[PDB]
Design a protein around this ligand. Sequence first.
Ligand SMILES: CC(=O)Nc1ccc2c(c1)ncn2C
Length: 154
Amino acid sequence: ASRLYTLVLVLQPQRVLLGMKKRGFGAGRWNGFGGKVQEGETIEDGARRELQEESGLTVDALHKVGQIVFEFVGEPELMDVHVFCTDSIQGTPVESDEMRPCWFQLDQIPFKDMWPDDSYWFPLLLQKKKFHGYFKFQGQDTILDYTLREVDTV
Ligand SMILES: CC(=O)Nc1ccc2c(c1)ncn2C
């Protein structure tokens, strides 16, 4: 019982792009860009499509960096999140009704206003490490338990 999702981090040598989500799941938190994968669409194409829809940016090269499974106690579907990174983009980030993008210096990543699991795996993402993770949540603020390990192949 799992549903595919993508998450794209535009990570440049001194900064990362995050978007403040205005409504829906995760509203009020800074997130990477992503969403559900369509029928007949590859995960990578879904990731490129969501990055454009949510940030206005066109990604050139995308790299697989992780896989994170989210469980919400009482929710039947697990979120199978395929995480990607890019340093090569085109366009300028666009603020829309749905998302407010902002660049953050790497030492100023706003973890207090992000999903709690980000504090766990961002340190790996910042050091160019790949990972497999699983986070069990109670509501949207509490991590009941988790696993996170570094991998050679996502
Ligand atoms: C950076 C980012 O968007 N991370 C993120 C994105 C979505 C997440 C999550 C963490 N933890 C649970 N959900 C649903």
